[PDB]
């Protein structure tokens, strides 16, 4: 016995029950894994220097406050 083949009826109603969720924000999953390697490798060396400078800045800020107290 034959039957139905295909229909898109009721599918738009189902998709909007819980809505079409908005896309993820642009700041959420932003990793350049497969990109241009020469630029990726260079950015790592800059980031390592930024982390080292961040640690040094907190050391001087803490020492200055302790001297005042």
């Amino acid at each position: 016995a034959k039957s139905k083949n295909h229909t898109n009826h009721n599918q738009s109603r189902k998709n909007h029950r819980n809505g079409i969720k908005p896309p993820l924000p642009l700041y959420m999953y932003n990793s350049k894994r497969g990109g241009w390697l020469p630029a990726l490798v260079n950015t790592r060396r800059v980031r390592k220097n930024n982390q080292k400078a961040a640690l040094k800045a907190r050391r001087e800020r803490l020492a200055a406050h302790q001297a005042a107290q």
Binding site: N18, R33, L62, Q69
Partner: protein, 191 residues
């Protein structure tokens, strides 16, 4: 009639009573329900909300995590100020990986026996929640902490182990029957 197109899908699941059978918990709930509704302190309203949570949603904290968080705060204190009181709605457990802590004042639902010995031996105090309401109503000079939940074994099983970029641990009965070669494995990353 009314439209009511998205009215039902906005309701939040909110519970106003505790499933616990402990009568000492119910005495604390009664005390902080009174304080929450009569002092307009956001601290007191938070404590009452957390006392109604289930055991799974009140994770334990470690003594080492308390000592590190306390030090990161008190190092910026002024000349004449005093260290705050750490408050956890949950259990405090001892950590054998620190062994050297300053004097701490901690209020919690429960202390393990070893944790109580280490705190008292260092010069600190263990407090009950009825002691905190007695000496620090409205929660002045307090530090509120929660405790970790992301390291649990149940969380590691969430998801599907066979989809690209998953890193989910499968539910394995026979460990040797689910080994798989180094090749034929799913892709480890996906954008």
């Amino acid at each position: 009639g009314v439209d009511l197109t998205g009215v039902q899908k906005k309701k939040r699941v909110v519970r106003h009573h505790t499933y616990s059978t402990n009568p000492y918990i119910k005495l604390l709930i009664k005390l902080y329900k009174f304080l929450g509704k009569r002092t307009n302190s956001p601290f007191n309203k938070l404590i009452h909300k957390r006392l109604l949570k289930s055991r799974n949603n009140r994770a334990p904290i470690s003594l080492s995590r308390i000592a590190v968080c306390m030090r990161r705060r008190t190092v910026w204190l002024k000349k004449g100020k005093k260290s705050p009181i750490a408050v956890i709605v949950g259990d405090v457990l001892d950590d054998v990986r620190m062994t050297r802590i300053p004097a701490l004042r901690i209020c919690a639902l429960r202390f393990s026996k070893s944790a109580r010995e280490r705190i008292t031996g260092a010069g600190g105090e263990c407090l009950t929640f009825d002691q905190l309401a007695m000496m620090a109503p409205t929660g002045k000079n307090t530090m509120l902490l929660r405790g970790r939940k992301s390291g649990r074994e149940s969380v590691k099983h969430f998801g599907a182990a066979g989809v690209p970029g998953s890193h989910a641990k499968p539910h394995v009965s026979s460990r040797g029957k689910e080994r798989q070669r180094s090749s034929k494995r799913r892709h480890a990353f996906r954008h």
